[PDB]
Each structure stands twice: as structure tokens, then as C-alpha cells.
Amino acid sequence: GASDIVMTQSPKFMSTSVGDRVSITCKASQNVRTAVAWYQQKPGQSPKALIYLASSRHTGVPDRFTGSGSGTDFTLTISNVQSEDLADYFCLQHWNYPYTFGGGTKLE
Amino acid sequence: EVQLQESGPSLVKPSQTLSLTCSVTGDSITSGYWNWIRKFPGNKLEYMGYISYSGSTYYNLSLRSRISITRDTSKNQYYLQLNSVTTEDTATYYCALITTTTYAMDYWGQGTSVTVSSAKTTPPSVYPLAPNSMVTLGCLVKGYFPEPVTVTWNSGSLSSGVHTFPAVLQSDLYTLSSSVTVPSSTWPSETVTCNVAHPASSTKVDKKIVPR
Amino acid sequence: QVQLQESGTELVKPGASVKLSCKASGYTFTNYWMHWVKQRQGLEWIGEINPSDGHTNYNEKFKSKATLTVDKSSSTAYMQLSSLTSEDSAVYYCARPWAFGNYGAWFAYWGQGTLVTVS
Amino acid sequence: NIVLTQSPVSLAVSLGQRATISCRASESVDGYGNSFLHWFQQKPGQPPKLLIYLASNLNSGVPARFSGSGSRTDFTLTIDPVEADDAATYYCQQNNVDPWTFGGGTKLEIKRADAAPTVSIFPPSSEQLTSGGASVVCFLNNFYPKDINVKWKIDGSERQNGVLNSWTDQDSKDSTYSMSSTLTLTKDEYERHNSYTCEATHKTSTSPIVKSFNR
């Protein structure tokens, strides 16, 4: 539908060295307040939640992962990048139906 | 019949950490959502956050980076930590439960007063107020810090006809009064005593009201 | 631990239908709705069902494709995909919301996923 | 962020009659088949008490005098008939959307018959005197309406500094209000004057209501 919220996620992919800090952004086409979650997904595995409500860390997620933003602009920052972090990352908005995801970012 | 009870310091210095405990009896904290809420002196309520039965937490947006809620399932207690408090964190703090029966904060502790100040704890002086079908007597509780103070009459036996007035703050000291009206037949025939307690200074005074 | 265990890989002939399952445990099944998600490379939300009363809400894009049901007694959620084409080849996930209400709707616990291949 | 606005901010309703109070949300609090909007009553010195949950459900044990209606962004709490015990502030609360919030509250006053204050004046106690202080206390008790003014006089002359006042909330039983006024002097100042007077002005009286004592 024309009124569906689009989550525009950038970058599409990136490479970095261990120890570096990287950022992933998501632009919502409509104001979604703080109803944005971020996920990590490794090949052959299901997504695992990293951040919810824009900035809270899910249980057990290391503080190397930070979320910020509200309204239409959201960022996931991964500090001290580790080998374990090479994966896909996705945002999700759950402000209004239909719920929609960003297109993904591959960290390689 | 779940019961919740807040405890912790009534007075905290600015920039320090505020810590409170909620002790739960009757129901296990491994069910429902366990909340902290506060009420400012101007009476506005602010929802602070919860820890769920599963241990997940929800921190309200405005407190999201200053707060921590934890629990101890063995002791059936949960905990609030509020960091770097300022005078704006002065409030009555409540713990409350949300069950999935109502999705609403349905059971509430009686609340605990927390004052954030550099002012020093000071005990009150208690003065009897003594002077028609009815007679009105009183007690003046003067110069204490911080809130609160409790006043009963005849150990709570004397209930109706009592007015205990909200405390007034002057030069970082509070003053409060309480009045009681009784049939003139009963006083001074039967004794009338005010019982004043100020937990923060470990003060308990009984003041018998005597005719002048 | 919350656990969502989905059924195995499916091979489906073009135009046929398939019903996937997701068995839930480690929480009270009927106290939470259940979402379903499709992944071909990105993710798409299909719809949601309330196990308590069977109420469903679909993404309009999938209204003619997916049908959600539950079996309360077995704590199992089902998704029937109808008349498949190659565009339906994907991994499908079931997922449980974090909590209640809209603030709690984010997908906190996921199944391992089910591969469906049309051929 | 979502905001809940309650209106009116205060209202006075006669015993036996209907209170209607409103809560408007800036964002919809409906989700998953429910309106996550709840109503609370808070009496002074007590925690809030749940009245209505999920917009329109009576909380167990609450009188059916209380009822809730509405959906999405417009809600109403109705209390009918109002009873003396309903003197309280009423709050709405939503937990559909982050951040969870409360409305700013609506104070319900019971409109009862006018009643003049009972005024009582009390000299300083010998206890306080022996310690060097002198507080003269005036109680102005059980009046209605709440609007009232107190004036102190020492030997016929008005005194303004050294006076602290306190007002109670509306009584849950008789729907009246009360006020306490204290004039604090030094013992030495207190002892060089004879007449101490406290005067109330109130709608019920065309002349101030005065109590006095001579030292």
C-alpha cells in the first residue's frame, strides 16, 4: 500500500578491521517515534534482537552495540568490531501496520 | 493477596545514587510485571519502568540512561537504582504490579518519600496546643527535616475529628500541626495525647495535652 | 528459555499449498500473539494471530497467500501458504512479541525458520 | 512523545450527581484489540487505586458508580452518583506506546452546603517558651467553600511576617476544608504584647470571624 512505512537502511554492505567502530542508519518514511528494533543475523540462523525501542539493549547483548534516534532517523553503532559481528543487520518498525523491515546491511 | 512494600533512604545527597527496594509477599515476582512509578511534590505522576517476570526490563524514555531495575527471585524483591540524582528527583516512589488480567498497574505499595538535598536531618520539637459542647486541641511539630512525619492521637484510638495539616517548608526546616476535636465532656476527663514520629531522626514523641 | 520450534524443510509443487507449524514453549502460549515473517534477501512481515481467540491481522500483500491458525491444546501456531509460485520460495519464521501492546510488539524470540522450495 | 490531556483540570459536583471527566491522547492507545487506557483515583496520603482498566472494564471490587468509555484517542470517566468519598484526583494512564505516560490529573471537589470555619486560637506552650520561641496557632476548621483568608493582629495591629499557613485537601467524610495558621515570634517579642488575634474572611460571613487571647 501507498501508506506503508518504508525503512531505508544504509549502507548496503561494508568491510572493516577488528577493533573499529561502524554505524548503520535507518530512515523511516513516516514518524515511527521510538518503535524501532535492530537485529543481527548470521548465515543459516534466525535474526537475534540487539536493540529495542530505538535505544535499549536486549538481554545479554554486549554494550558494544548502541542504538539511538527517534522519529524518522535511527542509528545502530557497533564499537570494537569483533569477528563474531560479521553478519547481516536489519531494522524493524512496529509503529503501525504493516510492520516493515529495513533492507539489511552486510558487515563483512 | 499480593502485597508490595518500598524501602530505602528518605534522604539522598545530590549527585549520589538513589537506591530503593520493593519487597513482595503473597505472589512470586516470577509472574507479572513489576513497576516503579514516582509522584512529584506538585503531584504529577511519572512512570519509571519495569522488570518482567522473565527478567526483561522496560525503562521509560526520559529515564532510559539513568535507571536500572534488577531483582532477586530467591528473596522475592526487586530494586530501583536512579543515578546522579538532583533536587528534581525529590518525589514519592511507588512499586506496583501489572498482571495480564488487566494490563494495568493493579496493586500498589504505600509509597516511600525520597528527598534529594544537602540539608541535614533534624528532629522535630513537639508542642502541645491547649485552650462550648466540643473542644479542639492540637499539636505543633516544628523544625524538622526531611519529610515525612506521622501524627496519631491516643495511639490511633482517636480517629474522627482529626486534621493533620500538610507540612510547610521554611529555611530547609518543616513545620506541621494537627488538631483534634472531642466532646468537652471527655477532656480533660479522659487524657488526649499526640504521638509524633519522625523515622529519619529516629524520633518518637508522645505529648499529653494538659489544661493551662 | 522461550523456544519456537518450526517444522522441517518443504518441497512444494507449483500451485500446491503447504501448512507450516511452530511449536511454542517456555512461556504461556495464549498470553502472546504470534507473528510470521518471510525471507527470500530481506524480511517481510506476513501477519499475526492471537492464540487466545484466533483473531488475525494480515499484511495486505499476503492476504491472498497466507492463512494463520493455532492449536491451543498443543501450543502450536500454523501458517498455510496457498497455490505456490517460485516467488514463495523462502525461509519462513515464526516469532513472538516481546510483550503486550504496540510498544511490546517487536519480535523478541524467533523460530529456527522453515525453508520452503517450490519446484 | 505521546501526551494524555485531562479536562477539566478541576470540577465541583453535588452529592448524588454526575461527574464527567475527559482524557485525550495525542497518539492512539489502541492495539491488539484493546484500548490500553486505564483510570486511577488518588486520595491524599495514599497511592493511586485502579478504577477502570482497558478503557471500559470495572476493576474487581470497585463500585459500578465508576464507568469508562471511549477508544483510540478520546476517553471518558463517569462517576454517578458522586459520593463524599470520591473527593480525590483522577488520573488516566496509557501503556500502549513508548513512553508510558499519565495524564496531568483531574481534581474532583464535592459541592456541599456552605459552612463557616470553626476558629480556635492557641497561645505558645510553656515548653516552647522555656526554649525561647513563641508560636501562636490558629485552626480554621471544617469550612466550605475552600476559599478563605487569614489575618493576624498583635495589639490591634496587623502582622504579616512570621506567618506560615497550611491547607488540607477536601475531607472524605464531610466534604469540608480546613486551614492552619502559625504566627512565630521570639519569646521576647511575644512578652511585650498582650492581645493576639486571628481573623478569617469567608463567603459565609459578612464580617471576619475572629478569635483572640490576651497574654
Which helices and strands occur, and which strands form pairs?
The complex is a heterotetramer of chains A (108), B (212), C (119) and D (215).
Chain A lengths: L6 E4 L2 E2 L7 E7 L7 E6 L6 E5 L3 E2 L7 E6 L2 E6 L8 E7 L6 E2 L3 E3 L1
Parallel strand pairs in A: 2-11
Antiparallel strand pairs in A: 1-3, 3-8, 4-5, 4-9, 5-6, 7-8, 9-10, 9-11
Chain B lengths: L2 E5 L3 E2 L5 E8 L7 E7 L5 E8 L4 E3 L7 E6 L4 E6 L8 E8 L6 E4 L3 E5 L8 E5 L4 E11 L5 E4 L8 E3 L3 E3 L2 E11 L9 E6 L4 E6 L4
Chain D lengths: L3 E4 L2 E5 L4 E7 L4 E2 L2 E2 L1 E6 L6 E5 L3 E2 L7 E6 L2 E6 L8 E7 L6 E2 L3 E6 L6 E5 L3 H5 L2 E11 L5 E6 L2 E3 L3 E5 L9 E10 H4 L4 E7 L7 E6 L1
In short:
The complex is a heterotetramer of chains A (108), B (212), C (119) and D (215). Chain B has strands spanning 3-7, 11-12, 18-25, 33-39, 45-52, 57-59, 67-72, 77-82, 91-98, 105-108, 112-116, 125-129, 134-144, 150-153, 162-164, 168-170, 173-183, 193-198, 203-208.
Measured between the Cα atoms of the first and last residue of chain C, the distance is: 36 Å
Radius of gyration of chain C: 13 Å
Largest sheet of chain A: 7 strands, mixed
DSSP summary: helix tally of chain A = 0
Q: What is the tally of beta strands of chain A?
A: 11
> Structural class, judged by helices and strands of chain C?
mainly beta
Number of helices of chain C: 0
Oligomer: heterotetramer
| Shape field of chain C | globular
Helicity range of the residues of chain C?
under 10%
Strand residues, percent of chain A? over 45%
Instruction: Please give the domain count of chain C.
Output: 1
For the terminal residues of chain A, how far apart are their CA atoms? 34 Å
Order of helices and strands of chain C: EEEEEEEEEEE
Instruction: Report the β-strand fraction of chain C as a percent range.
Output: over 45%
The share of residues in helices of chain A is under 10%
| Order of SSEs of chain A | EEEEEEEEEEE
**Major sheet of chain C:** 7 strands, mixed
Task: Categorize the overall geometry of chain A.
Answer: globular
Most extensive protein-chain contact, per-chain counts = B-D, 44 and 49 residues
**Tally of strands of chain C:** 11
PDB class: immune system
Keywords: anti-idiotype, antigen binding fragment, single chain Fv, complex, immune system
Assembly: tetrameric
Entry title: Antibody-anti-idiotype complex: AP33 Fab (hepatitis C virus E2 antibody) - B2.1A scFv (anti-idiotype)
Task: Tell me what you see in this structure.
The complex is a heterotetramer of chains A (about 110), B (about 210), C (about 120) and D (about 220). Chain B is mainly beta. Chain B contains no helices and 19 strands. Helices cover about 0% and strands about 50% of the residues of chain B. In chain B, the strands form 4 sheets. In chain B, strands 2, 4, 5, 6, 9, 10 and 11 form a 7-stranded mixed sheet that branches. Chain C has one domain. Chain C has strands at about 5, 10, 20-25, 35-40, 45-50, 55-60, 65-70, 75-80, 90-95, 105-110, 115-119. Chain D has about 220 residues and is mainly β. In chain D, strands 2, 6, 7, 8, 11, 12 and 13 form a 7-stranded mixed sheet that branches. A 4-stranded antiparallel sheet of chain D has the order 1-3-10-9, with no helix packed on it. Chain D has a 4-stranded antiparallel sheet with strand order 14-15-19-18. The longest helix of chain D is centred in the middle third of the chain and has 5 residues, at about 125-130. Chains in contact: A-B, A-C, A-D, B-C, B-D, C-D. It is classed as immune system. The entry lists the keywords anti-idiotype, antigen binding fragment, single chain Fv, complex, immune system. It forms a tetrameric assembly.
